[PDB]
Amino acid sequence: GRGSEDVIKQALKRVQQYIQQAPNGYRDVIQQILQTVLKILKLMGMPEVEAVLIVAYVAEMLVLAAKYGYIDELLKLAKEALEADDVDKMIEIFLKMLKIMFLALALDPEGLKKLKELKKNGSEEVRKLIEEVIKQLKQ
Amino acid sequence: SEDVIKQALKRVQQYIQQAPNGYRDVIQQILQTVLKILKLMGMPEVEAVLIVAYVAEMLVLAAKYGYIDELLKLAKEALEADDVDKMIEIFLKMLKIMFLALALDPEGLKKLKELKKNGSEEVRKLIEEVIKQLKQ
Numbered sequence: 001g002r003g004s005e006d007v008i009k010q011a012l013k014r015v016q017q018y019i020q021q022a023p024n025g026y027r028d029v030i031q032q033i034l035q036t037v038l039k040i041l042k043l044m045g046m047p048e049v050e051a052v053l054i055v056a057y058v059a060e061m062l063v064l065a066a067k068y069g070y071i072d073e074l075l076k077l078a079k080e081a082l083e084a085d086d087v088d089k090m091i092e093i094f095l096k097m098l099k100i101m102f103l104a105l106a107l108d109p110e111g112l113k114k115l116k117e118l119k120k121n122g123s124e125e126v127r128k129l130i131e132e133v134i135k136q137l138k139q
Numbered sequence: 140s141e142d143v144i145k146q147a148l149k150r151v152q153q154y155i156q157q158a159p160n161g162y163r164d165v166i167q168q169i170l171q172t173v174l175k176i177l178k179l180m181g182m183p184e185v186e187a188v189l190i191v192a193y194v195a196e197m198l199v200l201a202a203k204y205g206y207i208d209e210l211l212k213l214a215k216e217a218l219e220a221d222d223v224d225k226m227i228e229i230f231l232k233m234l235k236i237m238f239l240a241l242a243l244d245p246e247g248l249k250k251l252k253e254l255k256k257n258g259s260e261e262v263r264k265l266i267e268e269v270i271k272q273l274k275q
Contacts, residue, residue, distance in 0.1 A: 001184060002143070002185060003141050003142070006185075029264050029267050029271075045246075075272065078261075079269060087248070088242065090255060091235075094238070106223050117179060117180070125176070125214075126219055128172070132169075132211070135162065
């Protein structure tokens with residue numbers, strides 16, 4: 001492949017395209033949200049390539065889910081996740097947002113198209129997981 | 140260094156080489172076929188390799204708490220599932236275990252607690268987006 005800068009450039013260009021596709025008037029606060037989230041993920045000690053790819057993949061799934069009307073529900077859960085009581089309640093709502101984004105990927109005709117190939121192509125994968133699950137049982 | 144694919148595959152291989160030798164070859168085969176599947180999903184090769192290395196990191200941490208047996212059975216059940224919806228439900232169960240291993244990790248929970256106290260900056264901007272959306 002290429003360098004870390006090439007991955008970050010391509011992914012951040014993808015994110016910027018997602019922000020340009022939002023109604024003007026939201027792009028300012030959306031630009032601010034991208035800045036602090038990247039800052040927060042940087043203070044996590046997480047490598048910048050991992051954080052940028054997480055941001056880019058979530059942003060792509062936020063755009064797809066917004067096209068099917070789920071942006072209102074996702075923003076509501078994002079508020080509850082950050083205002084929750086403890087850490088364990090945050091992840092619970094985090095996994096709830098991830099579910100809606102994943103099901104919106106299944107509602108997308110092209111996303112369901114590729115999600116079915118992910119299911120079929122896994123045929124060679126089940127046997128190997130079965131093969132070593134059997135080996136782990138003997139251990 | 141200039142090639143993150145070289146860096147990621149070096150990280151992935153060191154996980155496989157340190158695994159019990161009885162599973163070495165079967166893990167290598169799983170690695171090659173998973174990379175074949177991700178490329179078929181329209182994912183760039185540089186991102187597919189990176190996406191295989193970061194998940195392998197979480198698999199190593201979750202295996203330290205005895206969760207590798209559950210994750211493999213969930214992976215088998217998700218692939219042999221009936222519909223796409225059920226496969227997504229089982230995949231979310233795998234993600235629940237991933238987040239649980241991060242919370243059980245000492246440094247992971249420390250940084251996870253940093254979010255419950257650094258989220259305040261992110262709420263005020265998304266509430267601004269919420270208020271602007273409730274207008275329309």
